[PDB]
Structure 1
Amino acid sequence: MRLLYLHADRFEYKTVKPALKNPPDPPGEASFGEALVVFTTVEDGDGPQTVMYAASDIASHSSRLKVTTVILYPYAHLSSRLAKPMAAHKRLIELEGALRTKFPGHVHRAPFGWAKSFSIACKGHPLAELSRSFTE
């Protein structure tokens, strides 16, 4: 699993056209104030252990940043060892579930399988943009 942690002043997205033949989530849009936006690329061989490490780290980082909102944003582009779409969707659902057991704020998982437009205003402090790798 490869993640990018963007500490944002604001974030929004809208699904546009499907990017998979049959997207497993309905279309949607959402907008947020201050949030940790987590661009999430699920990799081949990510299992439940990987999900658990990611969730713990996101919760830990969120606490450090004093953010009360995390956006789990599926992203195909952080890796060249992607898990297949249905495995990826499952791992992202697990990640959302795991994060809720560790982090007490708003957890929003953006829909999987869509092309999206988005806007972000990313903060400029030294911890505002970090990357993470998890595996098992």
Structure 2
Amino acid sequence: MRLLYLHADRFEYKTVKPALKNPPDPPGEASFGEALVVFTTVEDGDGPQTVMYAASDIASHSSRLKVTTVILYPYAHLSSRLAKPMAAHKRLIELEGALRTKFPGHVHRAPFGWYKSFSIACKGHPLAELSRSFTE
């Protein structure tokens, strides 16, 4: 799993065209205030240990940043060892679940299998943009 942590002042996305033949999630849109936006690329090796490691780290970083909202934003472009779409959607659902056991704020999982527009206003402080890798 490869993650990008973006500490945002605001974030919004809207699904546009379907990326996959049958996207497993419905279309939609959402917007937020201050949040940790977690661009998430699911990799071939990822299993339950990977998910839990990622859940704990996202929780800790969020604690350190004093954020109370985390967006899990599926993203295909952070690495060159992608899992297949079915496995990735399963891992992202598991990650959402795991995070809720470690982090007490709002967790929003953005829809999987869609092309999307988004806007972010990312903070410029020292810890506002960090990458993470998890494996098992």
TM-score category, normalised to shorter length? over 0.9
Shift of the alpha carbon at 1:123? 0.2
CA distances 1:40-61 after superposition (whole Å, capped 9, x unpaired): 0000010000000000000000
When the two structures are aligned, how many residues end up with a matched partner?
136
1:18 and 2:18 aligned: yes
Q: Distance in 2 between matches of 1:107 and 1:81?
A: 26
Partner in structure 1 of residue 70 of structure 2:
70
Partner in structure 2 of residue 107 of structure 1:
107
Shift of the alpha carbon at 1:4? 0.1
2:17 aligns to what SS in structure 1?
Answer: strand
CA distances 1:95-132 after superposition (whole Å, capped 9, x unpaired): 00000000000000000000000000000000000000
The Cα RMSD (Å) is 0.2
Q: Distance in 2 between matches of 1:134 and 1:57?
A: 10
Q: TM-score scaled to structure 1, two decimals?
A: 1.00
* Identical columns (%): 99
Q: Distance in 2 between matches of 1:14 and 1:42?
A: 21
Q: TM-score scaled to structure 2, two decimals?
A: 1.00
CA distances 1:48-92 after superposition (whole Å, capped 9, x unpaired): 000000000000000000000000000000011000000000000
Q: Distance in 1 between matches of 2:11 and 2:48?
A: 28
Q: Distance in 1 between matches of 2:75 and 2:29?
A: 16
Q: Distance in 2 between matches of 1:27 and 1:108?
A: 14
Q: Distance in 1 between matches of 2:84 and 2:110?
A: 18
Q: Unaligned regions of 5+ residues in structure 2, if any?
A: none
